[PDB]
Amino acid sequence: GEFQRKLYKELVKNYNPDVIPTQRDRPVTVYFSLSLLQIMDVDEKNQVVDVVIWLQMSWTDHYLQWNVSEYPGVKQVSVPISSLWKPDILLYNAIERPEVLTPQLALVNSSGHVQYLPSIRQRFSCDVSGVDTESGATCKLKFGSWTHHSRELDLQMQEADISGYIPYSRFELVGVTQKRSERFYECCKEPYPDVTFTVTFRKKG
Amino acid sequence: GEFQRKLYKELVKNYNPDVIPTQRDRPVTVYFSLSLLQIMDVDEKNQVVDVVIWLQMSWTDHYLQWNVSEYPGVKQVSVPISSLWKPDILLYNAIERPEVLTPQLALVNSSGHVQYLPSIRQRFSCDVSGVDTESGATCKLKFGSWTHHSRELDLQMQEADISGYIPYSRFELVGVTQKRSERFYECCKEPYPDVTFTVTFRKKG
Amino acid sequence: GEFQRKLYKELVKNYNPDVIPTQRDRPVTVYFSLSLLQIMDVDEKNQVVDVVIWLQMSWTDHYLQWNVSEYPGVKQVSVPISSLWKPDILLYNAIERPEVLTPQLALVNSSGHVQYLPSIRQRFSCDVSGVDTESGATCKLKFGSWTHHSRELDLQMQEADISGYIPYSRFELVGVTQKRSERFYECCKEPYPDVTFTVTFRKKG
Amino acid sequence: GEFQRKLYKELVKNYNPDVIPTQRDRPVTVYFSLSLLQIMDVDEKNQVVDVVIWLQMSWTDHYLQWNVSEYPGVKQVSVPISSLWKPDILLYNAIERPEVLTPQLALVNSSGHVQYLPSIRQRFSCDVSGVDTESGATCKLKFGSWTHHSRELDLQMQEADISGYIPYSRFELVGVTQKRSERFYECCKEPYPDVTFTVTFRKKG
Amino acid sequence: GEFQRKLYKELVKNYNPDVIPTQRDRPVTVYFSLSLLQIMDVDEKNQVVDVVIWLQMSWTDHYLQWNVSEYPGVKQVSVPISSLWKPDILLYNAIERPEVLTPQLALVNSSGHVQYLPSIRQRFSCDVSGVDTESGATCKLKFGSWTHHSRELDLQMQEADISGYIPYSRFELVGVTQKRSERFYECCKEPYPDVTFTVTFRKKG
Ligand SMILES: *[C@@H]1O[C@H](CO)[C@@H](O[C@@H]2O[C@H](CO)[C@@H](O[C@@H]3O[C@H](CO[C@H]4O[C@H](CO)[C@@H](O)[C@H](O)[C@@H]4O)[C@@H](O)[C@H](O[C@H]4O[C@H](CO)[C@@H](O)[C@H](O)[C@@H]4O)[C@@H]3O)[C@H](O)[C@H]2NC(C)=O)[C@H](O)[C@H]1NC(C)=O
Ligand SMILES: *[C@@H]1O[C@H](CO)[C@@H](O[C@@H]2O[C@H](CO)[C@@H](O[C@@H]3O[C@H](CO)[C@@H](O)[C@H](O)[C@@H]3O)[C@H](O)[C@H]2NC(C)=O)[C@H](O)[C@H]1NC(C)=O
Ligand SMILES: *[C@@H]1O[C@H](CO)[C@@H](O[C@@H]2O[C@H](CO)[C@@H](O[C@@H]3O[C@H](CO)[C@@H](O)[C@H](O)[C@@H]3O)[C@H](O)[C@H]2NC(C)=O)[C@H](O)[C@H]1NC(C)=O
Ligand SMILES: *[C@@H]1O[C@H](CO)[C@@H](O[C@@H]2O[C@H](CO)[C@@H](O)[C@H](O)[C@H]2NC(C)=O)[C@H](O)[C@H]1NC(C)=O
Ligand SMILES: *[C@@H]1O[C@H](CO)[C@@H](O[C@@H]2O[C@H](CO)[C@@H](O)[C@H](O)[C@H]2NC(C)=O)[C@H](O)[C@H]1NC(C)=O
Ligand SMILES: O=C(Nc1ccc(Br)cn1)[C@@H]1CCCNC1
């Protein structure tokens, strides 16, 4: 791509990926969603769950926009996430770092809309004593920004599915639910939005 | 030697390896193939398979071509893959990152034809309940680009091998098959090509 | 952030993050505290404890201050800890490196006050023979600077918590305590401050 | 000291360590040899062997030569292998990456002769069903260049050792042998040299 | 603070940390010593020992000296070891890389005297068949430079400790000893100094 190469040359000018791309008094809105793909194992003694999940993040970076008439054919581009601002979201339940299974790339369109969809292997903390009963075991997965409050980063959920769930795993799903919440912590005087996914599962036999 | 060093100096000028090397409305065609070398282990409880496979990728980068009369004796060069555009292909079944066994190098000829043949240790998801029966257990390995559609990256399969398979492993092969598929998904208005390899194997005793 | 981007450009000028930001004959005061989140496992044979703990560090870097009238709306900024001076604190009991669960980011306000709150998975050495008794097993966690004495880095403790402790872990807490200590060795004429947190716990069965 | 520092400044000028240092129609000859230090474990079920081996590589880089009269006292220098051209040799039997135990440094003399002697922990594939018999189990270790043919990189073996072998390991050696081989495939018109070491060992009980 | 920042700016000028800081025909003398902190585990089948040890290295770098009258108050500085020349010492018995537990920092005074005291978790090879007897099991730990001979790097031992040994480990110490040696080998025409520490220990039950 000749035009793509000219575009990347224009896009890098003055762009600093350590700065959140806010504007006037508008936050950056980040749409967040999840697909549970597989439950791999449960550690009943240490109260741990091992999963593969597919995170889905979307936002708008007003510094990454261009005139599509000026760069013809260049509808959307594939950029390594390392060279963009990325929201600093994390799973509060985790007891190990995430292992990232997908390429570390994001899609960007001409509006400056960004899409980043990492698939991750993750172990996390949960009371799983009921996993071998009819009613099963329920676990929470709280996600949110580490350093940014509502007025800087507006976290917003989108609807999940379980169409990706694996049929041949020895755990079946009894229920899922999701909820956006906004809260105060003692630390900080502003409010912090989180998105929490709840999964009830159990052993098949 | 001397000429190769002058060549690398000319090739780096203006080359950006984060940009796919397309032109007008010609995709980059990537020829993709595979050799299964060994099945290392199977986890019957967690439904996982552990393998060593030898991936074979070939494409053409019109920015990596040179006049062989200007660089005499320089027929082909050995370049670290880190300094080229590389196709963003992945195994959709994987539940861990790949462990790469080979040097991270590619061969490039004077036309700009590129060749990259990584050998990989990889664990992936498969229903292997039938692995201890006469008919055995069948597993799929779906490969494809993470961000690029047909009009940008034309995935094309080539005929695969089991001539390298290991005789002393405790699993025998009952059959293999391979299939290219092209599909439309709700997400995107363009089509996405994948290449899928299917292996049926079973335990010897 | 337009102003944030201008600010980072001014803050990097002459900043060297390998130099401790002392001034005249004032040390850098570092306020240090902790929250115990979970006891994951105990190795009775090897005398090891596995935990998740949330460290809380605060200090002031007089090179990171700015006039808020010059950078309007810029109250506080989110910076990667890699590009600041960071205190060289460690856990003297540790027998493995720390696994850092949180994003490696710190908050900085317009005074130059810095805040860094890593959450960590850590294995460490402790006599845990009494863990299966009524009175239980007591373990110490000694923290302090590796290279800096009191006149350069003034370590100060703050009151630690167990409000985050996990209810479903198979260990219950019998008590906690904390103590700052300042000490001389024959070697060196200056004193060295440490902060030590003590936890008594036991097995629920 | 002073002269070594001046020498490194002159040696880096125009040196590109991604280019093989060939000349006219002379390959780079690489002398390759090995010492088996210890057999650590054998996995009879998965057909794997775990070893520590000491590789010994020597070659000549005509770009790394200097006049010893101009740099007096500077007979040989210790350089990090990362800043030289290194041959792209690998073990074809390996099923995991190598764990390098030694410092990543090479010795260079005033002729431009280079010496690099990494010691490595390595797991590899071998039929070890006979390991518990009188005649024992034989395993091959095939080494060679990944991208370079005979006219570019002349692989040459040298006589190997077992004088370093550990007496207290539970495996004894019944024999070793070594062989250089040169081979054609239909694909490619140039020949490819490998060096293979064969070890027969058995369990002492 | 201000003066330290000016000093680091002057010290980096012309400093190349890949070059050993020798002078005329004076080697760099490196004083080396050790404290055994804990024996963590023993593998009786594979003949391996797991330890934590505290290495103590001191030398003089005549390029890192400054006039204390010119940089008032600047008695000593804390520098990351990555930006200095460091001696290339290793443990010849090791079968895994070292896990470094301490911050990677060294102390430097105005004379150019350097101090670097890494604490390390390390597994190594030893005959430990006698570990369950009255007389116990003896193991050697040979340290020395990988690339430097006596005329460049003069290794010198200093008297070691067991005052830091852990009382609650299930191994007790029966004795320690230490010895500096200098040798010629066929390889090399110059002599090579090593420092070896011997530890006899046994199981308490
Ligand atoms: C960046 O973020 C930091 C992090 O806290 C802020 O720093 C604090 O700022 C506050 C607000 O100005 C300071 O508050 C003052 O603290 C002083 C503390 O010192 C005394 O008290 C304790 C004893 O318990 C000891 O630390 C010390 O030895 C002293 O004895 C007080 O002197 C002040 O009290 C006075 O002010 C109040 C107003 O709040 C008056 O109403 C009272 O009458 C009284 O006169 C006050 O409490 C605090 O010092 C700072 N803390 C730290 C840790 O630095 C920065 O302010 C913030 N950036 C910006 C721009 O605000
Ligand atoms: C860059 O990508 C973004 C994300 O796909 C595009 O934004 C989307 O734009 C469309 C039309 O502008 C929006 O569709 C409308 O949605 C509402 C309901 O949500 C509905 O009432 C309308 O009838 C219509 O369906 C869509 O909401 C919007 N989504 C987001 C998250 O912004 C954008 O158009 C792309 N840019 C270019 C130049 O193609
Ligand atoms: C730089 O280092 C290299 C190390 O290899 C030196 O090269 C080799 O030096 C040896 C010295 O023994 C030469 O050996 C010769 O080999 C025959 C063996 O049949 C022997 O009979 C001769 O008497 C002689 O010793 C060898 O020629 C040479 N390497 C090769 C590939 O031929 C080199 O000398 C060093 N240079 C300097 C200036 O230090
Ligand atoms: C660069 O490599 C390409 C691909 O290997 C070469 O093109 C092939 O050459 C063979 C000759 O045996 C043809 O039959 C194939 O059809 C070609 N393949 C493709 C995919 O085009 C080409 O010859 C090489 N370049 C040079 C200058 O020799
Ligand atoms: C820099 O540090 C070295 C390391 O200790 C100091 O040298 C030692 O100082 C004592 C006390 O005078 C002597 O008895 C030792 O023999 C010295 N040398 C060594 C190699 O241990 C040195 O004095 C310090 N320099 C300054 C200017 O403070
Ligand atoms: O022990 C305290 N804090 C503390 C100490 C260690 C740990 Br772990 C957790 N919390 C006291 C508790 C009562 C109030 N003052 C601090």
Author numbering:
A (entry chain E), B (entry chain D), C (entry chain A), D (entry chain C), E (entry chain B): 0 to 204
According to the publication:
In the present study, we expanded on these observations and engineered α7-AChBPVS, an α7-AChBP with additional humanizing mutations in one of the allosteric binding sites, known as the vestibule-binding site. The neurotransmitter-binding site is located in the ligand-binding domain at the interface between each of two subunits, whereas the channel gate is at a spatially distinct, yet conformationally coupled location in the pore domain.
Fragment molecule CU2017 binds to a binding site near the β8–β9 loop in α7-AChBPVS (in red). CU2017 contains a single bromine atom and the observed anomalous signal unambiguously pinpoints the location of this fragment molecule. Van der Waals interactions are formed with Leu-33, Glu-158, Asp-160, Ile-161, Val-175, Thr-176, Phe-196, and Val-198. Additionally, interactions are formed with interacting residues from a neighboring pentamer in the crystal packing, Val-67 and Ser-68, and it is likely that these residues contribute to added ligand stability in the A subunit.
